[PDB]
Design a protein around this ligand. Structure first.
Ligand SMILES: CC(=O)[C@@H](O)[C@H](O)COP(=O)(O)O
Ligand SMILES: CC(=O)[C@@H](O)[C@H](O)COP(=O)(O)O
Lengths: 232, 232
């Protein structure tokens, strides 16, 4: 099973709610995804409560460590959870992580008793630093948020998996089911996605597709695939 | 649902038995795959009968139209089915189709009342010729049999899907779950595979992975994925 912090999860698909068009369709999509853990940018909380899904407060849009830390502290007080998806962004065109401010925020939040899940790049040194800092997982992006471009650098994901001692979550840029299966085949422990489902023409169908895709890639990873060969 | 010939199938995963190491593991893998249709090279038939799976006799190893036609006629008489997976191979290094002899065999077998499912290349003119001949599906290879290389030419698969009026089955070269999901995302109606499961370290786990992968890619195809964009 997937173990992060003090929790064991039956599903390796972590949903985000970014892009959600309306609560009734989001409800159907969350049920179809089978998720147990859903990120919410600090109606929606009530919905997660009614569905039995654990909220994961996220510091989306934070531009500095100070801003992220303060956002997380307000959420912990209001929502009674010490889990946080830590997002510190340098740029609005790219929604690219600010690595310097990310590590500073993670240090502060780990020292303050949070279970920290950081949105990070595919840099393997930065992933080892976030793990050494005390993050409960590391979540390298596949491609920038909302682009649907899939896993741009499978080799760096494999490098992060090789050097990790906490779960590795592929966390941004998924566009379709084969991308999520590939993440698991590369050795990720989980996939976090939002746009591919919330902006699909049929979000509940795409959520069911991603639940199946994460299962498919995890089973294929475990089952020992055949080698590639040049001749038949 | 998937309709081929006079049949409607609840599963879009078609299993092959090539590479099977022993009948007891093959049984567990066929159950886990959820398949309704399994190819058998002309014990094993009894197993398909006990599982409720429809056999698809195949002319594997045939090197000429005459050899394939004769093999199919013997199978129809012995097995009481007019369905056939038509395979005519030019080369043992490549197991590459012989297009000339394939079309000749398909003409003869369609004229003799068979439901013909041809193993073909990714040539879009040859796929239109096999459909015009009267084949009940066309089954373009992803990569050569048993290589595990996946879908070598997604653009030609998309060309075949665009110009087809019978189901398109991706039929060879699958290596892992994301390959089968991709086939469905490109618009194939079904996936046929054998080696990726029968030669996996854990064939029943890999069969469950492929059932999930085919479901995942079909739902993603139907659900209207997000466009790719350069900036977040
Ligand atoms: C929690 C995080 O802020 C994500 O939900 C982000 O939206 C995911 O990226 P995609 O939208 O590209 O899946
Ligand atoms: C029926 C046909 O002859 C196949 O079963 C072939 O074995 C499939 O190719 P893969 O083994 O590469 O899936």
């Amino acid at each position: 099973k997937l173990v992060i912090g003090d929790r064991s999860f039956a599903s390796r698909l972590i949903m985000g709610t970014g892009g959600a068009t309306n609560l009734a369709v989001l409800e159907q999509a969350l049920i179809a995804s089978g998720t147990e853990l859903t990120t919410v940018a600090i109606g929606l909380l009530d919905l997660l409560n009614r569905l039995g899904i654990t909220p994961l407060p996220n510091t989306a849009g934070s531009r500095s460590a100070a801003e992220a830390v303060l956002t997380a502290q307000l959420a912990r007080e209001a929502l009674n959870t010490n889990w946080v998806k830590l997002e510190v962004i340098a740029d609005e065109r790219t929604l690219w992580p600010d690595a310097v401010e990310l590590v500073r925020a993670a240090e502060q939040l780990v020292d303050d008793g949070f279970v920290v899940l950081p949105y990070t790049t595919d840099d393997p040194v930065l992933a080892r630093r976030l793990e050494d800092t005390g993050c409960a997982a590391v979540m390298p992006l596949g491609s920038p948020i909302g682009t649907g471009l899939g896993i741009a650098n499978p080799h760096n994901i494999e490098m992060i998996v090789a050097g990790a001692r906490v779960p590795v979550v592929l966390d941004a840029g998924i566009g379709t089911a084969s991308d999520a299966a590939l993440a698991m085949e590369l050795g990720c422990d989980a996939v976090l996605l939002a746009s591919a489902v919330t902006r699909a023409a049929d979000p509940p169908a795409m959520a069911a597709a991603m639940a199946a895709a994460v299962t498919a890639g995890y089973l294929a990873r475990c089952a020992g695939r055949i080698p590639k060969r040049f001749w038949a």
